[PDB]
Scaffold this active site. Sequence first.
Site, PDB file in Angstrom:
ATOM      1  N   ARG A  62       0.905  -1.195  -0.065  1.00 49.27           N
ATOM      2  CA  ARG A  62      -0.121  -0.042   0.027  1.00 49.27           C
ATOM      3  C   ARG A  62       0.813   1.098  -0.014  1.00 49.27           C
ATOM      4  O   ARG A  62       1.695   1.372   0.970  1.00 49.27           O
ATOM      5  CB  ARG A  62      -0.921   0.186   1.181  1.00 49.27           C
ATOM      6  CG  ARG A  62      -2.295   0.703   0.893  1.00 49.27           C
ATOM      7  CD  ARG A  62      -3.092   1.098   2.170  1.00 49.27           C
ATOM      8  NE  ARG A  62      -3.355   2.392   2.074  1.00 49.27           N
ATOM      9  CZ  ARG A  62      -3.431   3.345   3.195  1.00 49.27           C
ATOM     10  NH1 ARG A  62      -2.858   2.950   4.342  1.00 49.27           N
ATOM     11  NH2 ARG A  62      -3.769   4.559   2.872  1.00 49.27           N
ATOM     12  N   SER A  65       0.178   7.927   0.294  1.00 51.31           N
ATOM     13  CA  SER A  65       0.718   9.143  -0.100  1.00 51.31           C
ATOM     14  C   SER A  65       1.942   9.248  -1.302  1.00 51.31           C
ATOM     15  O   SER A  65       2.408  10.014  -1.984  1.00 51.31           O
ATOM     16  CB  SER A  65       1.078  10.134   0.905  1.00 51.31           C
ATOM     17  OG  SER A  65       0.201   9.985   2.175  1.00 51.31           O
ATOM     18  N   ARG A 162     -14.747  12.587  -1.085  1.00 51.97           N
ATOM     19  CA  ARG A 162     -13.333  13.091  -1.347  1.00 51.97           C
ATOM     20  C   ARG A 162     -12.999  14.512  -2.116  1.00 51.97           C
ATOM     21  O   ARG A 162     -12.025  15.181  -1.716  1.00 51.97           O
ATOM     22  CB  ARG A 162     -12.531  12.042  -2.365  1.00 51.97           C
ATOM     23  CG  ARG A 162     -12.466  10.634  -1.722  1.00 51.97           C
ATOM     24  CD  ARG A 162     -11.128   9.843  -1.650  1.00 51.97           C
ATOM     25  NE  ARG A 162     -10.115  10.886  -0.680  1.00 51.97           N
ATOM     26  CZ  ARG A 162      -8.996  10.715  -1.293  1.00 51.97           C
ATOM     27  NH1 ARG A 162      -8.292   9.967  -1.820  1.00 51.97           N
ATOM     28  NH2 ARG A 162      -8.167  11.543  -0.721  1.00 51.97           N
ATOM     29  N   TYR A 177      -0.857  21.164   2.657  1.00 46.47           N
ATOM     30  CA  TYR A 177      -1.144  19.853   2.045  1.00 46.47           C
ATOM     31  C   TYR A 177      -2.346  19.291   2.067  1.00 46.47           C
ATOM     32  O   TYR A 177      -3.307  19.064   2.973  1.00 46.47           O
ATOM     33  CB  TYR A 177      -0.249  18.568   2.996  1.00 46.47           C
ATOM     34  CG  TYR A 177      -0.245  17.540   2.433  1.00 46.47           C
ATOM     35  CD1 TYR A 177       0.278  17.046   1.138  1.00 46.47           C
ATOM     36  CD2 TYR A 177      -0.974  16.351   3.444  1.00 46.47           C
ATOM     37  CE1 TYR A 177       0.110  15.695   0.753  1.00 46.47           C
ATOM     38  CE2 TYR A 177      -0.591  14.960   2.920  1.00 46.47           C
ATOM     39  CZ  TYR A 177      -0.488  14.675   1.738  1.00 46.47           C
ATOM     40  OH  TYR A 177      -0.457  13.534   1.057  1.00 46.47           O
ATOM     41  N   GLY A 346       2.350   6.787   4.230  1.00 49.06           N
ATOM     42  CA  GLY A 346       1.856   6.435   5.445  1.00 49.06           C
ATOM     43  C   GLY A 346       2.492   5.260   6.193  1.00 49.06           C
ATOM     44  O   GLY A 346       3.094   5.371   7.004  1.00 49.06           O
ATOM     45  N   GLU A 368       2.423   1.045  10.024  1.00 51.23           N
ATOM     46  CA  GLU A 368       1.821   2.274  10.343  1.00 51.23           C
ATOM     47  C   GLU A 368       2.097   2.441  12.061  1.00 51.23           C
ATOM     48  O   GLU A 368       2.161   1.240  12.803  1.00 51.23           O
ATOM     49  CB  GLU A 368       0.265   2.463  10.171  1.00 51.23           C
ATOM     50  CG  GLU A 368       0.054   2.123   8.737  1.00 51.23           C
ATOM     51  CD  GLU A 368      -0.479   3.393   7.966  1.00 51.23           C
ATOM     52  OE1 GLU A 368      -1.544   3.276   7.055  1.00 51.23           O
ATOM     53  OE2 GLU A 368      -0.022   4.441   7.906  1.00 51.23           O
ATOM     54  N   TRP A 370       3.155   6.653  10.737  1.00 46.84           N
ATOM     55  CA  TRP A 370       3.847   7.353   9.985  1.00 46.84           C
ATOM     56  C   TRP A 370       4.851   8.078  11.156  1.00 46.84           C
ATOM     57  O   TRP A 370       4.685   8.215  12.086  1.00 46.84           O
ATOM     58  CB  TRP A 370       3.371   8.528   9.056  1.00 46.84           C
ATOM     59  CG  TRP A 370       4.232   9.657   8.566  1.00 46.84           C
ATOM     60  CD1 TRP A 370       4.496  10.831   9.148  1.00 46.84           C
ATOM     61  CD2 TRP A 370       5.058   9.648   7.470  1.00 46.84           C
ATOM     62  NE1 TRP A 370       5.274  11.381   8.657  1.00 46.84           N
ATOM     63  CE2 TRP A 370       5.899  10.633   7.521  1.00 46.84           C
ATOM     64  CE3 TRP A 370       5.450   8.682   6.551  1.00 46.84           C
ATOM     65  CZ2 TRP A 370       6.779  11.147   6.633  1.00 46.84           C
ATOM     66  CZ3 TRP A 370       6.373   8.949   5.492  1.00 46.84           C
ATOM     67  CH2 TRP A 370       7.046  10.301   5.392  1.00 46.84           C
TER      68      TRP A 370
END
Length: 393
Positions: A62, A65, A162, A177, A346, A368, A370
Amino acid sequence: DPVVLMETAFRKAVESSQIPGAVLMARDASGRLNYTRCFGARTVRRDENNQLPPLQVDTPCRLASATKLLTTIMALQCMERGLVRLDETVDRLLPDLCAMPVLEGFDDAGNPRLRERRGKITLRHLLTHTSGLSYVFLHPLLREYVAQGHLQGAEKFGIQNRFAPPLVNDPGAEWIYGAGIDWAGKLVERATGLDLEQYLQENICAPLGITDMTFKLQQRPDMLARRADMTHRNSSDGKLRYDDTCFGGQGVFSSPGSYMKVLHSLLKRDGLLLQPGTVDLMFQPALEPRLEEQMNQHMDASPHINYGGPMPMVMRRSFGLGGIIALEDLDGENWRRKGSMTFGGGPNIIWQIDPKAGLCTLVFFQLEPWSDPVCRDLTRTFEKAIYAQYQQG
């Protein structure tokens, strides 16, 4: 010596059950440097045969970002093909984004205060986070807007959650961001009439000879059965735990190796993905001085976020198309140089392209949260060890 001690470090970080595993990759222009090391298992969850499947270079991860680099690359390919002008108003392709009001705040009655945006949005604003868009969670007003349930109307216009939130500022007013890249992904789909998954295959995967890269992982059972599972680090005991949780900003699943192939192309200036001149433009510090200052002021003040990761907490940085630019050498010769562009993902994913040094590296973790200290320190060590070997060698 530095590399050996650096591998010694990882071996003992997996041994100690501190990290699930890591994939370390380093490539240089010349072909001299082709470092590729695979540590530990891909999941902390034991399999059906009570073993732990390894984290290999072919393992689909995955990206999170990390996908924003790939989208930037797509958006620039459209621009390269004359489908968009970088400093042209998104108006034609993104009429939705252009309709969006800006959240001033709220009145006494709790009601939102909205205003017409001043100034236009270009792919550059989008690609450089100067669009005026935030992420709901990152902005106080947006967070307030979301809890008091203002995106309830979205349903009736078919607006996707979204892309349903409003602008927090005018374009080019500040570095925030935000969802700029997911919107750029929309433009790519709308310019080409191809979905990001199809476009990514045709324009990114196919020319570099890539299989282990997709947006629609579920449709690839071939790649699904081989994927890494997400690992989380207990805020409590520091132990590791199994976690079971078409947008341009995050949606991508890629193996470490497949991502490297992208970066390597960018470093080499092979012209396979983008024109070398277009790639040179990506590494240009895109930010206006006012914004360059504002960005650093915020980034230095936000160690809780830490957009840099392995990067020094306080430093002179700017942003370009696809990532953050080092406006100074990180440790002179010993490590990363001026004009080095980088970005993360992430699950402790971190990539960089050092054109000045002629190096590109990636650290793939499926862990995870981050900026995890263990991961951060390990990454700092890998890059530094590599730069050490390349220089003397």
